[PDB]
Scaffold this active site. Structure first.
Site, short mmCIF file in Angstrom:
data_model
loop_
_atom_site.label_atom_id
_atom_site.label_comp_id
_atom_site.label_asym_id
_atom_site.label_seq_id
_atom_site.Cartn_x
_atom_site.Cartn_y
_atom_site.Cartn_z
N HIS A 151 -3.10 5.76 55.84
CA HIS A 151 -1.77 5.87 56.43
C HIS A 151 -1.63 7.02 57.45
O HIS A 151 -0.58 7.15 58.07
CB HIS A 151 -0.63 5.91 55.39
CG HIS A 151 -0.55 7.15 54.56
ND1 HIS A 151 -0.06 8.34 55.09
CD2 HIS A 151 -0.81 7.33 53.25
CE1 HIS A 151 -0.08 9.21 54.09
NE2 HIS A 151 -0.53 8.65 52.97
N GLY A 165 2.82 16.60 53.36
CA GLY A 165 1.60 17.19 53.90
C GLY A 165 0.48 17.31 52.87
O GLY A 165 -0.67 17.59 53.24
N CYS A 182 -0.75 14.81 51.23
CA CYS A 182 -1.54 13.57 51.22
C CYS A 182 -3.00 13.87 51.54
O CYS A 182 -3.29 14.74 52.35
CB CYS A 182 -0.96 12.54 52.17
SG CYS A 182 0.74 12.04 51.77
O1 LIG Z 1 5.04 9.89 50.39
C1 LIG Z 1 4.69 10.55 51.36
N1 LIG Z 1 4.48 11.89 51.32
C2 LIG Z 1 4.56 12.74 50.20
C3 LIG Z 1 3.57 12.83 49.23
N2 LIG Z 1 3.66 13.56 48.10
C4 LIG Z 1 4.77 14.24 47.90
C5 LIG Z 1 5.87 14.25 48.79
C6 LIG Z 1 7.06 14.98 48.54
C7 LIG Z 1 8.09 14.96 49.44
C8 LIG Z 1 7.98 14.23 50.62
C9 LIG Z 1 6.86 13.50 50.89
C10 LIG Z 1 5.76 13.49 49.98
C11 LIG Z 1 4.43 9.91 52.73
C12 LIG Z 1 5.53 10.26 53.73
N3 LIG Z 1 6.78 9.66 53.25
S1 LIG Z 1 8.19 10.42 53.60
O2 LIG Z 1 8.01 11.84 53.57
O3 LIG Z 1 9.25 9.83 52.84
C13 LIG Z 1 8.45 9.96 55.31
C14 LIG Z 1 9.59 10.54 56.08
C15 LIG Z 1 8.21 10.99 56.37
C16 LIG Z 1 6.80 8.19 53.24
C17 LIG Z 1 5.50 7.61 52.73
C18 LIG Z 1 5.41 6.24 52.50
C19 LIG Z 1 4.21 5.65 52.13
C20 LIG Z 1 3.10 6.44 51.99
CL1 LIG Z 1 1.58 5.70 51.53
C21 LIG Z 1 3.15 7.80 52.19
C22 LIG Z 1 4.35 8.41 52.54
#
Ligand SMILES: O=C(Nc1cncc2ccccc12)[C@@H]1CN(S(=O)(=O)C2CC2)Cc2ccc(Cl)cc21
Ligand SMILES: [Cl-]
EC number: 3.4.19.12
Lengths: 305, 302
Positions: free
Chosen positions: B41, B143, B145
């Site tokens: 991603h 960040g 990920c």
């Molecule tokens: O979940 C994800 N990241 C995170 C990962 N871990 C803990 C987080 C804590 C808090 C914010 C994010 C976090 C990413 C990015 N986000 S999001 O931030 O909501 C987007 C607006 C940028 C959607 C998303 C969707 C699908 C996938 Cl595969 C990855 C992801």
């Protein structure tokens, strides 16, 4: 999201762990530049640990009596000296993996990471706190002596603890890196006991702010209290007194959540008098006191090393 | 004495963490030999996140679109391929700090250490378990990920998890190092929810044996149970079924303490009925399920 008991990355400390053997005793040492630091009780035998005269025991040892092993390499000891309860073994080789470091003495209630080691080999890393009674609730077995406690600030490792012994209650006692014990303990086999422990109040409050930041708000109330009123309540539950310094330290977390420190104290007072009532806070049914205000800010913002 | 939630020393993994940037997205990668592994991603433009066609997005990329940074050094990408939900970036330098390693896929209940990273820099290490619902209860921010889960046995690092996303309940989902997700999750921002979570029964039993080894016996009783009666009661408290494999696995701990597995099962049934009554077990007021039978033997013996 999420709140875990998190330790510092241990890599900078792993490259410093060595094995120290003297006679029948084998424990861990910390190799920084051309010196290996380890507990001075490595020179003790069966009769010695009863009433040890460390100056008398050390004068009888020569450099070649101390076998130091860094991985599969034997380091040669070229000198030795004692500083309080720590033995300093001068070696011929400076550790090429020596990080930027400082020796710091911590206060009760401060936290640090422990790299548990056996035979100079790191086996685990855990986060813990110096209890108000100066013991640490660690996880140590025989051979873990010389394992170290540390914090990492940017790229500098601050060494704050060296393990020396286990007390009869299963808790642990040790020194700073200058060989000064934390607590009224001595390094010998004798009747020693940890004093009555208390809860680190400033740390519980920081952990309640961490719960609020993570969406847990059930314990909050409309009430506030005074420092005098809270400290009276806290003394009844074996909680450490909360000072104006603690309130000042909690200021940033109070500003971020919108909950004044004395407002969180009224929440803590209600929790001490009424309990959790089947509920949990951050997955715990007990009030957690091993996260400092700085640990909460660092974790709920993601600071890197 | 003492029982702590202990993580593996992270040094071997720290020397593998790199930063991967593609367009506006920056996340972590794992540099082993001449390959950097990261979530696929990283190629998504957030406008793709709903229904991304990763094959279509990847074919439009060239090697020079992926900026890889190892410390203050930029690595040169000489090739790229996708394997399931993981992107593999071939680089022109083999990591000199590459440890002895294996890619292992774990089962629910298994524990591992997580090295949480931001911008290719390690910030903390913690101990985790793969929940029965295939999520992990981690501590991650945006960040993080590409942060990895691992175990260390002797000198070999077994990589078992790579972080990809946070679900709406605050729990985390990810893949093994071959890009196969744990659970029914997809690397899409579509409506996804973790299934009802349950307690890892075999791990609670291992933790009760750890309490007996360290001197805590207050919870033991004079009763035993059949395995089926135990499961009938355990299911009512949202505990995972205990299998004959679990009973066999607990054999060494049963032999060391002198308490039969089904006798310890009767103790757990009574704890579920009564609660702890103001008492604790190994410093905890809840029944702990993130220590496996293997973790208990390792921490209580070596
Ligand atoms: O979940 C994800 N990241 C995170 C990962 N871990 C803990 C987080 C804590 C808090 C914010 C994010 C976090 C990413 C990015 N986000 S999001 O931030 O909501 C987007 C607006 C940028 C959607 C998303 C969707 C699908 C996938 Cl595969 C990855 C992801
Ligand atoms: Cl497994």
């Amino acid at each position: 999201s999420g709140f875990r008991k998190m330790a510092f990355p241990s890599g900078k400390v792993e490259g410093c762990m060595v094995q120290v053997t003297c006679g029948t005793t084998t424990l861990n040492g910390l190799w920084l530049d051309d010196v290996v630091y380890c507990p001075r009780h490595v020179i003790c035998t069966s009769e010695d640990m009863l009433n040890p005269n460390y100056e008398d025991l050390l004068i009888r040892k020569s450099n070649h009596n101390f076998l130091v092993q860094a991985g599969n390499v034997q380091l040669r000891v070229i000198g030795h000296s004692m500083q309080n309860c720590v033995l300093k073994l001068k070696v011929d080789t400076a550790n090429p993996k020596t990080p930027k470091y400082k020796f710091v003495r911590i206060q009760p209630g401060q936290t640090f990471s422990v790299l548990a080691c056996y035979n100079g080999s790191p086996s685990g890393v855990y986060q813990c706190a110096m209890r108000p009674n100066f013991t640490i609730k660690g996880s140590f077995l025989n051979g873990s002596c010389g394992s170290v406690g540390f914090n990492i600030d940017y790229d500098c490792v601050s060494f704050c603890y060296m393990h020396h012994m286990e007390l009869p209650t299963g808790v642990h006692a040790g020194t700073d890196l200058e060989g000064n014990f934390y607590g009224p303990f001595v390094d010998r086999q004798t009747a020693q006991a940890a004093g009555t422990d208390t809860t680190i109040t400033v740390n519980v409050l920081a952990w309640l702010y961490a719960a609020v930041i993570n969406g847990d708000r059930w314990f909050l109330n409309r009430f506030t209290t005074t420092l005098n009123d809270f400290n009276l309540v806290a003394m009844k539950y074996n909680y450490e007194p909360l000072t104006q310094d603690h309130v000042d330290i909690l200021g940033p977390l109070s500003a971020q959540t919108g909950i004044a420190v004395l407002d969180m104290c009224a929440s803590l007072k209600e929790l001490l008098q009424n309990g959790m009532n089947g509920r949990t806070i951050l997955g715990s049914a007990l009030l957690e006191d091993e996260f400092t205000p700085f640990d909460v800010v660092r974790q709920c913002s993601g600071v890197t090393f």
